Amino acid sequence: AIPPDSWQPPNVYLETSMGIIVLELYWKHAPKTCKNFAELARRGYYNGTKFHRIIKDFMIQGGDPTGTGRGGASIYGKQFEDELHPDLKFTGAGILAMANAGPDTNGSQFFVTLAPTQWLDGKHTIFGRVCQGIGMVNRVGMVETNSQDRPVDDVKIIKAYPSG
């Protein structure tokens, strides 16, 4: 069924165990990706999940309800296409983008960058950024991780939701 294109909540909030992150979405550049992320949030799909992979000065990765890094699914019934733009580049911290497993394999997993990551340009859909809470994101990026880059203490998304 998928929400109508008219539904464009400007924000998605992540209430994490370390505080709230306010994301703002790039609806014009990445309409399908924004719809997916906002709708999964609205459904509660991300509630009680964790950032399963964090690498200092790189990014924080989450969005897999199994927590394995292997799972997650979109609202489209299949993995969906990239929405790439040369003029949206990984120029700094706070950028919201899709994790994937190759071209046009978007599901539910996403990441927020901790620094510039331009080697990812053209390979991951950029679909928003942090408007408020970058200080939190910066701190989350520093958490101790194991040899698999999994945080040793869970960093949970307690709740996620779009603007009402």
Binding site: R53, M59, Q61, R70, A99, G107, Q109, L120
Partner: peptide, 11 residues
């Protein structure tokens, strides 16, 4: 290394 994958994580 520095990827953000989903299934086969690389160095």
């Amino acid at each position: 290394x520095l990827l953000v994958t989903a299934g086969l994580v690389l160095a």
